[PDB]
């Protein structure tokens, strides 16, 4: 449920989402 262990290191929050979308690259694609 709730984590019993945490990190005291003040490292920055990193977005780990490696999912990508090619919607911005549609200028040379079919759009």
């Amino acid at each position: 449920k709730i984590p019993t262990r945490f990190s005291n290191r003040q490292n920055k929050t990193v977005n780990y989402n490696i999912d990508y979308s090619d919607d911005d690259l549609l200028e040379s694609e079919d759009d």
Partner: protein, 110 residues
């Protein structure tokens, strides 16, 4: 009056095995004498490093909508943290891939 065989890891408040680290230090051909607090200290250090990487890998699995840590999550957790990146910069992780990074020269025009 051998009271219930209290383990060293539970005495030290650790989860990593203190006595097994002591046995590996004694049989590892490092020195012919090993102090009492050295396996406690080393087990605590190994536990802390394992906990830090496992926490970042769990965060990386959470951001990828996964409930099971794969080597890709470990690679992302190691490479996105700069202190772990210069701890394991000479280390290959199998089935880990690379960080998604594109140089800004190669980006198109707008």
């Amino acid at each position: 009056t051998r009271a219930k065989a209290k383990t060293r890891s539970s005495r030290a408040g650790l989860q990593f095995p203190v006595g097994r680290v002591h046995r590996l230090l004694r049989k590892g051909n490092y020195a012919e004498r090993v102090g009492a607090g050295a396996p406690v200290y080393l087990a605590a250090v190994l536990e802390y490093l394992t906990a830090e990487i496992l926490e970042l890998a769990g965060n990386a699995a959470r951001d990828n909508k996964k409930t099971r840590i794969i080597p890709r999550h470990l690679q992302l957790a190691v490479r996105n943290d700069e202190e772990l990146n210069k701890l394991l910069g000479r280390v290959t992780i199998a089935q880990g891939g690379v960080l998604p990074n594109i140089q800004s020269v190669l980006l198109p025009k707008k």
